[PDB]
Amino acid sequence: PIVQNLQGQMVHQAISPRTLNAWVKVVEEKAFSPEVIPMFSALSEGATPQDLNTMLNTVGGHQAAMQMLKETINEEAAEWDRLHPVHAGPIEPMREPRGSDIAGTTSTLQEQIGWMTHNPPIPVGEIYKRWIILGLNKIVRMY
Amino acid sequence: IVQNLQGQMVHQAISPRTLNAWVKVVEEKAFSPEVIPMFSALSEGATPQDLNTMLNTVGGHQAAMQMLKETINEEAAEWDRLHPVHAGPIEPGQMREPRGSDIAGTTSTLQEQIGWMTHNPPIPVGEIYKRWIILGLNKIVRMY
Ligand SMILES: [Cl-]
Ligand SMILES: [Cl-]
Numbered sequence: 001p002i003v004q005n006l007q008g009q010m011v012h013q014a015i016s017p018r019t020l021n022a023w024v025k026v027v028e029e030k031a032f033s034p035e036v037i038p039m040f041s042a043l044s045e046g047a048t049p050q051d052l053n054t055m056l057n058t059v060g061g062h063q064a065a066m067q068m069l070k071e072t073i074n075e076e077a078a079e080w081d082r083l084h085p086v087h088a089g090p091i092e093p094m095r096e097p098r099g100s101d102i103a104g105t106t107s108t109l110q111e112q113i114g115w116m117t118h119n120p121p122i123p124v125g126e127i128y129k130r131w132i133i134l135g136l137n138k139i140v141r142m143y
Numbered sequence: 144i145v146q147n148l149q150g151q152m153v154h155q156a157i158s159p160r161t162l163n164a165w166v167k168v169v170e171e172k173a174f175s176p177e178v179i180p181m182f183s184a185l186s187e188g189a190t191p192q193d194l195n196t197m198l199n200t201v202g203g204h205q206a207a208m209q210m211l212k213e214t215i216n217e218e219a220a221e222w223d224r225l226h227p228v229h230a231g232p233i234e235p236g237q238m239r240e241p242r243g244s245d246i247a248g249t250t251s252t253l254q255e256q257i258g259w260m261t262h263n264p265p266i267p268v269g270e271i272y273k274r275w276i277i278l279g280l281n282k283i284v285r286m287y
Contacts, residue, residue, distance in 0.1 A: 002144060002152070006263055010152055022184030025177070035167070042164030042185060046144060119150035 001046040002113055010117045012109055015051055019043055023055055032065050032139045040136065041129070048112040049104030049128045056132070065139040072135035073128075077103050080127070094118065102128050154257050157193035161185055165197055174207050175287045179280050186276075189269050190256040191248030194276065207283040214279035215272075219243025222271070238262065246272050 003013040023043045030036040044052060059066055077099025086096045097115055101107035102124045115122040145155035165185050172178040186194060201208060222243040232239055241259055245251040246268045259266035 004144075004152060004261075016184075016187060018180070018183045019187055022180050025180055038160070038164050038167055041160045042158075045158060045160060117146070117152055119146070121146050 001051065002048065002116060010113055012048065012050075012113060015047075015054055020054075020058065024058060027059050031059060031062055032136060032143045034140050037133060037136050037140075041133070044125075044129055044132075047125050047129070048109060048116065049102060049107065049124055050109050050112060052125065052128050052132060053104045065142060068139055068142075069132065069135040072138060073103050073131050076131035076134065097122060097124055103131070104128065154190070156253075157189060157196055162196070162200065166200060169201050173201060173204055173287075174280060174283045176284050179277060179284070182280065183273070183277065186269075186273055189273065190253065190260065191246060191251065191268055191272050192253055192256060194269065194272050195248050198276070207286065210283050211276065211279040214282065215247055215275050218275040218278065219247050222246060241266060241268050247275075248272070 001013045001015070002010050005011050023040075026036060026039040026043065030039065040055075044055060047055070056066070056069070080099035080102060084096065086098075089095075094114060097107060097111070101111065101115075104112070107124075112124055115124045144152045147153050165182075168178060168181040168185065172181060182197070186197060189197070198208070198211065220243060226240070226242075228240045228242075238258055239255075241251065241255075245255065245259075248256065251268075256268055259268045
C-alpha cells in the first residue's frame with residue numbers, strides 16, 4: 001500500500017503479515033468460488049500494481065485458473081493502450097501509464113505511487129484490480 | 144488513504160468494500176476462531192471510529208457483543224490505571240495523551256484519533272483498541 005513518511009512524502013508500505021495471512025486463508029478456503037471476489041476486493045484496498053502481483057503470486061494451486069487470469073490481464077492491458085492513445089514520448093521532460101505499467105510488469109514501484117498520488121490520481125491500482133476481477137469472474141465458471 | 148481537493152493524501156474512513164467483506168465474514172464465521180485473522184486484516188489501519196463501525200455492524204450475537212463491551216470497559220479502566228498522566232499537557236497547544244475512553248472512541252474526535260495515530264512517534268490508538276477487541280474475541284470464541 002501507500003503511506004506518508006515523517007517527511008510528508010508518499011512511499012510504499014509492505015503488505016502486512018496480517019493482510020497476507022488473511023489472503024492466504026481466503027485462497028485456501030474459497031479460490032475461485034464467487035465468494036473469493038468481495039474478499040479480494042477488500043484485502044487489496046490501497047494496493048499498488050506490485051502489491052496486486054504479490055497477492056496473485058501467493059495463490060498456490062489453481063495453475064489453470066492462474067493462467068486464464070494472466071491471459072485476461074494481458075488482453076485488458078493491450079486494449080487499455082488502444083483506448084488510451086499517447087504521444088511517442090513525454091513532451092516534458094510524468095508519462096501516462098500503458099497497460100503493462102498498470103499490470104506492474106513495465107513500471108517501477110515509484111512510478112506506480114507517482115500515478116496513484118498524482119493530482120488528479122491516475123488510479124493504476126484500481127484499474128488493475130478491475131482487470132483482475134474481470135478475470136476472477138471468468139474463472140468462477142471453473143469452480 | 145484518499146486524495147482530497149487540495150491534492151493531498153489524507154485519511155479516509157472504512158470503505159464500502161472493507162465493510163462488505165466484514166459483513167460476509169460475520170455471516171460465515173462470527174465468532175468461531177477463524178473470525179479473528181479476518182477481523183485483524185480487515186481492520187488494518189482502522190481508527191477507533193472505524194472499529195466501532197465494525198463492531199456495530201454485527202447482526203445478532205448479542206451475548207458476544209455484551210462480553211465485548213465488558214472487556215473494552217475493563218481494558219479502558221486498566222489503561223487509565225497503567226498510564227498515569229498529568230492533569231493535561233504542560234505546554235499550551237500540545238497534544239493531550241489519550242485516555243481509555245479516547246482509545247475506545249467515546250470521548251475522542253476523528254481529528255484527535257488521526258492526530259495520535261500519525262504523531263512522531265505514533266500513539267497507535269487504533270492498534271491499542273484492536274488489541275482490546277481481540278482480547279474480547281478470544282474469550283467469545285469459546286462460545287462458538
Ligand atoms: Cl489506485
Ligand atoms: Cl493505530
